[PDB]
Design a protein around this ligand. Sequence first.
Ligand SMILES: NC(=O)c1ccc(N2CCOC2=O)cc1
Length: 124
Amino acid sequence: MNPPPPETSNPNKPKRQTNQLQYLLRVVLKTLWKHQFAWPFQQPVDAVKLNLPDYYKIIKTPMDMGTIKKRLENNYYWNAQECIQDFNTMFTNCYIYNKPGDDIVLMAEALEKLFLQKINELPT
Ligand SMILES: NC(=O)c1ccc(N2CCOC2=O)cc1
């Protein structure tokens, strides 16, 4: 069974737009999105559809790139680090719920490497 997906707007949270956040959407997210291994991470895990009744019993801070994309589009974040933290939560969740060597873990490992490569240098 599925919890509500993470919020993508919050009126009492202040918004901001920065060059770095713009780059995270235009370049980082949009590029990762097209990778052959991106598909498992483009939406919240649907435990009912995927028959993973223990997923949310294990993962308490769910995150996915669809959520991140909507957050960036809504200027939800204060700064780039806040957004980078969501990517890191998404990768870490995958390593937590699964096991080394699993196909989905190999996917996350590859994406994480590409992600780090892209955020190594951000605009000023
Ligand atoms: N986020 C995860 O740990 C996760 C997500 C999806 C899967 N499934 C079910 C469909 O194929 C998969 O790899 C398995 C694990």
